[PDB]
């Protein structure tokens, strides 16, 4: 009775799907990336909300940073992965502004559907977006008002680091700015390459955030196996070999032929190990840190000559200790150390938060490495502050590469929305519609700041263009209370990552163009 429609020309798939056209491929890639823009719109800004995200391993991730949210969400849409990998490249390049890519490119594709369904196809939206993107990189040097050049000390960088902290830790914006100032400035390479790997975070479970501090050195989570825990001289000899003797590598076999070789073998092994431990006690060492295991005879003479042993099973933690005390990891067993010793000020042990730690505390010569010891009530809170700390470390690397800053908090995106609209009105072609839609994509970025603050964004976005009458270029958003009456950004001190704003516009424009180039999708059968 009822007939059906079979395959027509190329239905040769064995369980796969095929998409072609503007409605089946182009418009469905837009609506899929629109849901990711509305997902992280709530967690954008200083008034953003956290998200308890549970991955496949049934563990909890609660954060307001959009970079670590997409790493736990198992997205299966192919065009949605293009806006996830574009936000991951913002984290690898500058380390801040990953939420800016999801809002800007999410608004670029949303306004692209309002252009393909109204008029010209993707051949002019792509060419219309690239014209306005090149002009967007010309206004950004003209919007620089301050610079992070004068007085590079712990007082000036405390206020310059408040913007990256208050966007994820709004209430703890003052204490975390001081902890990130005493750690980033202390590891300065004296006008050289700034390394973000030289700042570690030791999560200690215990009291609140007021007990957190920064120690000049390294803090581990291991034991001593001895009784020499009080060391004040701190002459550190670093070894990468296991501190248990010297065995061969091929087979290893003791061969006894008479009774004189059997009885003297046990006493000959103890005298061989005694001469090696006392060889480092004559050089003045106090702390001997090894990488491998340690025999029982090595612990007998370590406590006899009163030297402290530190076991580091990790090999990447052993390389960071050599940059801390200024030593060299020796692959051979204990030599007479000439000049490759370490030199610290105080190596001790203390039980903080029911966790016995080993602290290589530098008193006077403080700047070789820094470790921020965070204290939190939960283990999930210490992970969110560590994400806020690592965004502050990556902000200090941006100011090392480029000291320029632009007024954030919405003051930059309105001036970018005004100048691109001036290029769109003076364009004598049909591609001027995509240029005016490129400026409206900058309009939705302070719109997400007002919706998270509980303010009506229509009255917020109306006052921004009213105060930008060709000469102000600095008024952003005052989201501290309702009925905004928005003020200046240079006076409040909200300005951060001009180089972060430079790569975020370039990566989000190339992400939206790459989606619009996709006209035909051929997927396979998933497994």
């Amino acid at each position: 009775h009822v007939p059906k429609a079979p395959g027509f020309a190329q239905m040769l798939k064995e369980g796969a799907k095929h998409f072609s056209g503007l409605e089946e491929a182009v418009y469905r890639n837009i609506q899929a990336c629109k849901e990711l823009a509305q997902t992280t719109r709530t967690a954008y800004g200083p008034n953003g909300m956290n998200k308890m995200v549970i991955n496949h391993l049934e563990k909890l991730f609660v954060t307001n940073d959009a970079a670590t949210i997409l790493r736990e969400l198992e997205v299966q849409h192919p065009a949605a992965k293009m806006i996830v990998m574009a936000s991951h490249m913002q984290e690898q390049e500058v380390g801040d502004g990953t939420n800016f890519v999801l809002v800007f490119a999410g608004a670029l594709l949303e306004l692209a559907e309002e252009l393909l369904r109204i008029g010209l196809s993707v051949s002019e939206v792509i060419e219309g977006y690239e014209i306005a993107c090149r002009k967007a990189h010309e206004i950004l040097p003209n919007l620089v008002c301050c610079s992070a050049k004068n007085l590079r000390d712990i007082d000036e960088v405390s206020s310059l680091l408040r913007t990256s902290i208050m966007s994820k830790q709004y209430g703890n914006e003052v204490f975390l700015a001081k902890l990130i100032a005493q750690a980033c400035v202390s590891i300065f390479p004296d006008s050289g390459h700034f390394n973000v790997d030289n700042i570690r975070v030791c999560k200690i479970l215990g009291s609140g955030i007021s007990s957190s501090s920064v120690l000049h050195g390294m803090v581990f989570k291991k034991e001593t196996e001895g009784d020499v825990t009080s060391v004040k001289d701190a002459k550190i000899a670093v070894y990468s070999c296991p501190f248990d003797g010297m065995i061969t590598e091929t087979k290893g076999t003791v061969l006894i032929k008479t009774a004189e070789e059997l009885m003297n073998f046990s006493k000959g092994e103890e005298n061989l190990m005694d001469a090696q431990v006392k060889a480092i006690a004559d050089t003045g060492a106090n702390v001997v840190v090894t990488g491998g295991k340690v025999a029982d005879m090595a612990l007998h003479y370590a406590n006899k000559y009163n030297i402290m042993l530190v076991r580091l099973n990790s090999k990447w933690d052993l390389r960071r200790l050599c940059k801390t005390v200024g030593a060299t990891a020796l692959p051979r067993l204990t030599p007479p150390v000439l000049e490759e010793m370490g030199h610290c000020d105080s190596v001790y042990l203390s039980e903080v938060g029911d966790t016995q730690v080993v602290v290589f505390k530098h008193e006077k010569e403080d700047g070789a490495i820094s470790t921020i010891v965070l204290r939190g009530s939960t283990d999930n809170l210490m992970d969110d502050i560590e994400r806020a700390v690592d965004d502050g470390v990556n902000t200090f690397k941006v100011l090392t590469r480029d000291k320029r800053l632009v007024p954030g908090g919405g003051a930059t995106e309105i001036e970018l929305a005004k100048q691109i609209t001036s290029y769109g009105e003076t364009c004598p072609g049909l591609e001027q519609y995509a240029i005016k839609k490129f400026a409206e994509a900058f309009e939705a970025i302070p719109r997400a700041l007002a919706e998270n603050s509980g303010v009506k964004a229509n009255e917020v976005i109306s006052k921004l263009y009213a105060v930008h009458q060709e000469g102000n270029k600095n008024v952003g958003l005052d989201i501290e209370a309702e009925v905004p009456a928005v003020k200046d950004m240079l006076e409040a001190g909200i300005l951060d990552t001009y180089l972060g704003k430079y790569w975020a516009i370039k990566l989000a424009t190339n992400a939206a163009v790459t989606v619009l180039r996709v006209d035909q999708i051929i997927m396979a059968k998933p497994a």
Partner: protein, 525 residues
Amino acid sequence: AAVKTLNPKAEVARAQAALAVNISAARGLQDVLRTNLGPKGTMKMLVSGAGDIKLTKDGNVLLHEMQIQHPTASLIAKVATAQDDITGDGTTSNVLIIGELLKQADLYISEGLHPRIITEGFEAAKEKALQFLEEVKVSREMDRETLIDVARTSLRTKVHAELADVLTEAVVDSILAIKKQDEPIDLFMIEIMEMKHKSETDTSLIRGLVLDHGARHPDMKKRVEDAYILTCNVSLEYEKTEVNSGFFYKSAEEREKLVKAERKFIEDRVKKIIELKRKVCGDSDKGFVVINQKGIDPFSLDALSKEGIVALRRAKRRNMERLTLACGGVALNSFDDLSPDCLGHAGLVYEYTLGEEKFTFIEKCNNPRSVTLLIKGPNKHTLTQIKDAVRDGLRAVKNAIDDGCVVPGAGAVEVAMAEALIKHKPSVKGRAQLGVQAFADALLIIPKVLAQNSGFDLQETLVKIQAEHSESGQLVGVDLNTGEPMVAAEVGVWDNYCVKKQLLHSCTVIATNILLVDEIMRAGM
């Protein structure tokens, strides 16, 4: 797809997809039905789920009894149903034009052009092809030798030309003795009976009627000469009252007086019949035959057998119309005005039994105006060959009488119609120049299929036929024996005017509608 969003169990086809569905299905029905067009075609054996053999090659019987489940194949089967309903022949040639109107248009739509531009050229070509058909029709004043050649063409394309010489004398002579004086010929006056007596080449034309039932009494006469036909619609059997009453009697002797009383109203109808046999001067043989559409009880059959009246029962509805014209009597519904004026006449009424199945024959009428083709096929599938050919041949000679002009034969129409569209192809003055070329190449499949089914070359035959047409004025055609271009108006190959008129109109609208379909989908579950 949008239909997949709302209804996930609803398949769909897009613009370039639904065109490939309809075109590939039109070539599927084209490649099957092109092997049976004309006299040189091949027979098809159609077996259903029961196991009966249906051996035929008519285009309407092929499309109906075929295991195909396709929406495009169901659209052509609806157009092919109306072709065999009003004019008979022209069903196999109907599908090949639709299969070529979509194949020739596939070469232009896939090469950048729009399907609507091709449909604009089909209408401009159909108007010129319809005016050209009115110029090539030949009026021959409906001669009885012209109707032989018209019926010979339609019968040879359904039988192996040994029965076509027999069935031509049974179709033409049956259609002439129905109506005169320019009256519309009713095809219900010809009864089609299926026998099994001798062989397939023994189908004769009974000038009267053949009834499929015989006498229901062994004492009745089997052969009655010079009989009177009394056509009745009364019920001679026992019928109860409409109000349910029931008898009431006291004694046992009063019970038999009620059985005699309940049959008194029945026997009064029988006394009206046996008195009519005495009022027609019954001092001779004077046979009486009652067809009697309603059934007769055996109490009245025993009463009529003693008087010498043959009585039949349980006839058909149209037997009171065919026998009324054949016998010349009046079909009565009551016995209140019985008279010899309502009686019929036949010189011979006899019966014959074929395996406990009697057949009553009525013959020797003066002006019957109603006949019966007596098909005597040996097998069950051979009866379906002749029945599908008789109703194809009777509708062929009916259109040649109602229309005063006869259209020429196999290739004398389609070749000249395609060449007339080439000279009018630059007359459209627009983007529809290629639509007339696709319509002209689709009409040339009729000389292409008939040259392919005869074993000759397809392209070498069409060159010589179009050369003899362009270098002359005669409508030359295809020869199914030698392949040389021969004129169809002189060799005796004709066709109907209404068949070629409806082939240009039914195939054109169904091609302009299929090419404008782009959303084949299945929803409603």
